[PDB]
């Protein structure tokens, strides 16, 4: 429902950045960097949900989803 | 300008005011037990029901029909009438009490054929 | 005077039928994007 | 003499612990409450009034 | 007899958890509320009045 | 019968999270609210009045 | 029918974050607010009154 | 007098069709800039 209070603690909004390599072909995999965006304490053992990586032209060039590795 | 050769006085006015509107309302409150007379391909139930009450000097019929989705039925085996897709609700009666609420044939003809 | 045929303000069709989407390619991917604008 | 007649179909799971069920849980509810004697005869319209109610123009 | 008819196009993501959607989220909303019987016949202008409403000079 | 018609050009970045946009953010806004029936026919000036409104000297 | 037309020259650095600019920051502001129908025809002076307004001595 | 043809204040067209954009060059970059002003 539109009018409701959700107060989550296990979810963080993040920005994912990656490099599109030369001569990249569909189906190949690349590394991504996940950075928190607002008042999150940690991203220790989180899992990145399906994220479309846009280019400068605002077109989806990659789809990101995986487990984050934080140093510790 | 002498001898009122240009002296003039003229007036004019135009007005119009139209308006219109309509409103409809209906209310129904009651409880009726119906019977499932067909189970559809997707599991929805076609329901029909009738209650007849004869009080003193007449007979009233309350009929209902429609399609009920099973997941809308509450734990007390009850569903509000606004969750029934093809709701057909009828509340009629007979006897002189009902005959007293039908317009006279001549009045019902003048209601349709009189100029105003 | 109200029976005179008139042209409405929003001319044309006031509805659009969703166009069926392209058939996915046989590249082994679930993500399939229509002709990108 | 007054007659109160009832008929219908009752689902057993609607019957309460006191062997009772409200009349709104009966599917084909037929409820009748009639009477006879001059008290009932006094609540029937006269044949001429009952004819004018149907055949008079207004 | 009163007839309430509705037609339109509903986007599934607008439907709430109770399988309900407000009528303002339906694209081609066609809502009709009509009736018949002498109650409805009493709300139609007489043919002569309905003609004078269109053809009278003022 | 009442018809409410709308037309225009909407910039996608103006649409809110509830898939809604105020009508003042639509570029070529064409908004129409008309009706028919005798209620609408009662709000049209008589042909003679509508002629005197244009051709009378004052 | 009412028509609201606007035209002008807008400097991009005056546009706010909500893609909006007040009308006083537009250089060649041409703002028009007109209408048609008998409501508009009722606000035009009669040809004879509009002639006496220009040609009468006083 | 209201039927006299008149020229509006905002003459011309009151709408502009977005012009399709240039075809990106084949340099291996995602960023493509139209003829810069």
Swiss-Prot record, chain A:
Hey, which family's this protein in? Belongs to the FlgI family.
Record field: transmembrane: none
Specify the protein name. Flagellar P-ring protein
The free-text function statement in the UniProt record for this protein reads: Assembles around the rod to form the L-ring and probably protects the motor/basal body from shearing forces during rotation.
Q: Where in the cell is it found?
A: Periplasm; Bacterial flagellum basal body
Taxonomic classification, please?
A: Bacteria, Pseudomonadati, Pseudomonadota, Gammaproteobacteria, Enterobacterales
Q: How does it assemble?
A: The basal body constitutes a major portion of the flagellar organelle and consists of four rings (L,P,S, and M) mounted on a central rod.
Record's superkingdom?
Answer: Bacteria
UniProtKB/Swiss-Prot annotation, chains D, E, F, G:
**Keywords, sorted A to Z:** Bacterial flagellum, Cell outer membrane, Lipoprotein, Membrane, Palmitate, Signal
First and last residue shown, out of the full length, are 175 to 232 of 232
Record's Gene Ontology CC terms? bacterial-type flagellum basal body, distal rod, L ring; cell outer membrane
State any GO BP term from the record.
bacterial-type flagellum-dependent cell motility
Taxonomically, which superkingdom? Bacteria
UniProt main location, coarse: membrane
Record's keyword annotation contains Transferase: no
Subcellular locations according to the entry: Cell outer membrane; Bacterial flagellum basal body
Q: Which GO terms describe its molecular function?
A: cytoskeletal motor activity
What is the name listed in the Swiss-Prot or TrEMBL entry for this protein?
Flagellar L-ring protein
Its biological purpose: Assembles around the rod to form the L-ring and probably protects the motor/basal body from shearing forces during rotation.
Quaternary structure annotation from Swiss-Prot or TrEMBL: The basal body constitutes a major portion of the flagellar organelle and consists of four rings (L,P,S, and M) mounted on a central rod.
* Family membership noted in the UniProt record: Belongs to the FlgH family.
Please list the disulfide bridges: none
